[PDB]
Amino acid sequence: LLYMRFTENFERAKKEALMSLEIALRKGEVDEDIIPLLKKINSIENYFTTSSCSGRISVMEMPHVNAKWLGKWHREVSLYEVLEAIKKHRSGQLWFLVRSPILHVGAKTLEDAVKLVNLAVSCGFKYSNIKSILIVEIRSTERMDVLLGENGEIFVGEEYLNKIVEIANDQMRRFKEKLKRLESKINALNR
């Protein structure tokens, strides 16, 4: 571990990361909500972004092994598309999930990494940290894991799901306001 070489092979890593982002943008694989932030981060000389994603809502079932996704959305969802996803449930535990946007950022030095973590935390991404895999991870706290059923049996009704959907979308909107806040302050990291 070298303080001035926080991310190993930074030049090459950034080159590869930019190439991967170009493809993602081309195919639309990139979550439009985080595009602005990704471009701003990569514009700063001492950073680059890798496998990242915007907030997302999902319906999935898992044994207790390898889960199966029944529905996946990267924006505010509607009641009926979630209902349709739930009707696909057949086995295991059925969960309705809300995930915060997550960004992985390479950094030239430890100082660069720490400054980014501190800035991200100040903008609402309280779970931002330095991850060992070293890389910076930016993540918020509005996560949700709602148990909806088990082994083909749904425990909740439509009105209940409508309430869960309303709350999930409120988190999605909160995520967006946070990305915008961070995006507007990230230029402060430029030297």
Next chain:
Amino acid sequence: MLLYMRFTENFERAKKEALMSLEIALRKGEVDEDIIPLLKKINSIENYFTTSSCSGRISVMEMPHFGDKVNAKWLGKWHREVSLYEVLEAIKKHRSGQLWFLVRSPILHVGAKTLEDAVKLVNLAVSCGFKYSNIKSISNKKLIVEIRSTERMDVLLGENGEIFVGEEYLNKIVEIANDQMRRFKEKLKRLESKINAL
């Protein structure tokens, strides 16, 4: 301005201070007894010390909106597995806001003497089932490693006094919650047994 290596220079002092805080918390019975053995073991290792931590919790609480932990009121708070009756008694106290049944992973905060020591601990914790472990902060006073697991639950039970669930759904919720808590406890014990590796 982060001062490189200052936390290492300040380690001896930071550990002494952390130990004084733990010593009193223990005497006053403020530490989740569940992980007292683990905390003592971590502090027994030369290059680490512990700061405020917890062993996992199941909660029945009401808050204005899902996102606002600042505004919450706990009707029921447990750091152990629970019975349906305990949960029902907490639910009976619901009167305002959204009522939620929550399950949260244990969270340990550990100071490390060097960046290398921090990484070694993070990797060990991850290997023990705490996938959300990482380096939370680096200041001139200390470097904090956070140890946390991924399991959790967030189930809406009612709103503004109205309850949305029945006993069979509640039974299923409590069943899963207890399964998660049991996993948390198992992982904490696994970590305690592997700490010596460091």
